[PDB]
Amino acid sequence: VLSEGEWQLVLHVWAKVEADVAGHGQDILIRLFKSHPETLEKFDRFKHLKTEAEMKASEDLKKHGVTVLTALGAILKKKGHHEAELKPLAQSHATKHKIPIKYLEFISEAIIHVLHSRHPGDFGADAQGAMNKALELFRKDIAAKYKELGYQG
Ligand code: HEM
């Protein structure tokens, strides 16, 4: 479980992410798609995007960054008591979208990367470790739901 101090470091930098959810969402989805191209295949709606320039110019992809970051934000603010927020997400990413857990690791590493570039002063190693611990909790609670549904993997 994160400490209260750890949750504080997480929510403090998240409050900065919220000053521009759109730009963050963009960078994060683009970094995911460049680093792990197999991830982009899972979206019929973004599959036609071939370059970074194309991805940067797509209003829809930017609309979907907002969506994803808003969902994650609602979960972060619960500081671990995220049962009702996490249940729908896992059911859908397992049974409808077909997203292995590993990809959830990839997107985590992208989020950490982008938070670092954009918020150095608020994202030292101590905030880094705290954010990692939160995104592990996330992915740990999701995996247990996947396992329930028979999709562990
Ligand atoms: C922080 C982690 C992530 C969050 C919070 C997140 C959030 C969401 C939300 C809120 C939706 C729309 C509601 C729904 O369909 O359940 C969604 C849709 C989707 N997600 Fe994720 N997601 C995450 C990770 C991923 C990853 C890593 C992949 C693929 C590698 C992925 C693939 C999908 C697909 C294919 C859809 C449907 C998109 C569309 O066609 O409109 N998601 N996600």
Phi-psi region of 100 (alpha: psi -120 to 50; beta: other; left: phi over 0): beta
Domain ranges of the chain: 1-153
Residue whose CB lies within 8 A of the most ligand 1 atoms, among 45, 62, 89, 105, for a mutation test: 89
* d(C-alpha 123, C-alpha 12), whole Å: 9
- With 0-12 / 13-18 / 19 or more C-beta atoms within 10 angstroms meaning exposed / middle / buried, residue 85 is middle
Cα Dmax for the chain: 44
From which experimental method does this structure derive? X-ray
Cβ atoms within 10 A of the Cβ of 70, count?
Answer: 12
Tokens of 29: 């989805």
CA 112 to chain centroid, in Å, comes to 9
The three-state (H, E, C) secondary structure of 70-117, written as one string: HHHHHHHCCCCCCHHHHHHHHHHHHHCCCCCHHHHHHHHHHHHHHHHH
Phi (first) and psi of residue 100, to 5 degrees: -60, 160
* d(C-alpha 123, C-alpha 121), whole Å: 6
Tokens of 147: 């396992």
The domain over range 1-153 is classified in CATH as 3.40.50.300? no
* d(C-alpha 112, C-alpha 90), whole Å: 21
Written as one letter, the residue type at 92 is: S
Q: What is the resolution of this structure in A?
A: 1.8
Contact 113, 31 (CB under 8 A): yes
Pocket of ligand 1 (CB under 6 A): 39, 42-43, 45, 67-68, 71-72, 89, 92-93, 97, 99, 103-104, 107
Tokens of 6: 């750890």
